[PDB]
């Protein structure tokens, strides 16, 4: 009934659907149930740096492992990776552009000054 | 182990823990659970319009029931509300600026010409 509903309301029905995958994290069988949304960034966000999405994600888990000791909660991670994803597009940080690799960027550069609920001020070994 | 995992890796813990709060869905208190960071973009949309983020809620509520029928995958639906809210930031759609009301916007202006998975080409009654 106003420019707010007709925008939200009107989500393609299907990208809010959830799609199940299976992938090898650390070598075991693991399930991922995405919104299919959040699978169509993943992609995106693959694709930007050359990777296939599985190969993104296996990546994502490990480090994760590393930086946190387990990868707890990775479904929602991932979801929250999507979406960190295009607020730092929407900021700026990120060039919103597909030919820019990701790891081209400096992380340091990209995460500054960020508000605190968008990162972890711990860095990465 | 790159700029690419630094971003992604260090997203803040708390921002991908699920938060259940309780919702009033035509009539009927639901428990809606979402990761920390969905709930923290819901208040961003709401209080550029003024709106409370519970009145937020129910409104889109009752809006997706009127348009499809039903709200059925209501909690994946909220999801994928605050990851298009980004993306059509990032997209320059929606202005990156959160004192201007959606409300304000052309909402025809603002869907027109996006790839199919991001919007519903059947208008709002």
Redesign the interface.
């Known amino acids: 009934?106003?420019?707010?509903?007709?925008?939200?309301?009107?989500?393609?029905?299907?990208?809010?659907?959830?799609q199940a995958r299976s992938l090898r994290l650390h070598g075991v069988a693991t399930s991922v149930r995405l919104?299919?949304?959040?699978w169509?960034?993943l992609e995106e966000i693959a694709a930007r740096?050359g990777m296939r999405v599985t190969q993104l994600i296996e990546?994502?888990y490990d480090?994760?492992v590393q930086?946190?000791g387990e990868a707890a909660?990775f479904t929602?991670?991932l979801?929250?990776?999507?979406?960190?994803?295009?607020?730092?597009?929407?900021?700026?940080r990120?060039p919103?552009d597909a030919t820019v690799?990701?790891?081209?960027?400096?992380?340091?550069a990209?995460?500054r000054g960020l508000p605190?609920?968008?990162?972890?001020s711990?860095?990465?070994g």
Chains 1, 2 share one sequence.
């Open positions: 009934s106003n420019a707010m509903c007709e925008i939200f309301i009107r989500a393609n029905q299907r990208s809010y659907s959830v919104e299919q949304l959040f169509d960034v740096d990546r994502l480090e994760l930086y946190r909660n929602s991670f979801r929250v990776c999507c979406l960190r994803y295009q607020v730092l597009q929407a900021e700026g990120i919103a690799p990701i790891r081209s960027l400096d992380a340091q990209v995460l605190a609920n968008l990162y972890d711990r860095p990465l």
